[PDB]
């Protein structure tokens, strides 16, 4: 999660409880079903979760098929927002969306991530 500590944001793990509690509320919910996306939009307003903290999070509640197409199709978004010039405030001279978002203070970087992230999760692929 990005949390305030002195005067800024930063980094700090994932609470066991803040796993336990997201884990519990999901797991009877489709992968990329509507209230699949919305309980996870509630962690992400909840903790601001970097890309680790997402990806360290699916190892909860993703099976490894569906990570797998997840982060596939996330790789893909970002490529192509990037190419077709919807990513605000992003210059990749400075490092892939990625791996800016991680600052804590790259919120604004970061919360396109978190939506992007988001939205991969519609259309795993199926028959």
């Given at each position: 999660?990005?949390?305030s500590e002195?005067?800024?944001n930063?980094?700090?793990?994932?609470?066991?409880?803040?796993l336990?509690?997201?884990?519990?509320?999901?797991?009877n919910?489709a992968p990329?079903?509507?209230?699949w996306i919305?309980?996870?939009?509630?962690a992400?307003l909840?903790?601001?979760?970097?890309?680790?903290?997402?990806?360290?999070?699916?190892?909860?509640?993703?099976?490894?098929?569906d990570q797998?197409?997840?982060?596939?199709?996330?790789t893909?978004a970002i490529?192509?927002?990037?190419a077709?010039n919807?990513?605000?405030?992003?210059?990749?001279?400075?490092?892939t969306?990625?791996?800016?978002?991680?600052?804590?203070?790259?919120?604004?970087?970061?919360?396109?991530?978190?939506?992007?992230?988001?939205?991969?999760?519609?259309?795993?692929?199926?028959?």
């Open positions: 999660p990005i949390i002195g005067n800024r930063r980094h700090r793990a994932w609470a066991l409880r803040e336990q509690d997201i884990k519990k509320e999901i797991e919910k990329g079903s509507q209230v919305q309980t996870l939009r509630l992400i909840q903790a601001d979760p970097t890309p680790a903290d997402l990806e360290q999070l699916c190892q909860y509640i993703a099976s490894p098929v797998t197409a997840h982060m596939t199709s996330l893909a490529a192509a927002a990037e077709a919807t990513l605000q405030g992003f210059n990749p001279q400075n490092g969306l990625t791996q800016q978002s991680a600052q804590p203070n790259a919120g604004d970087l970061r919360s396109q991530y978190q939506n992007l992230w988001l939205q991969a999760w519609k259309n795993l692929p199926t028959r």
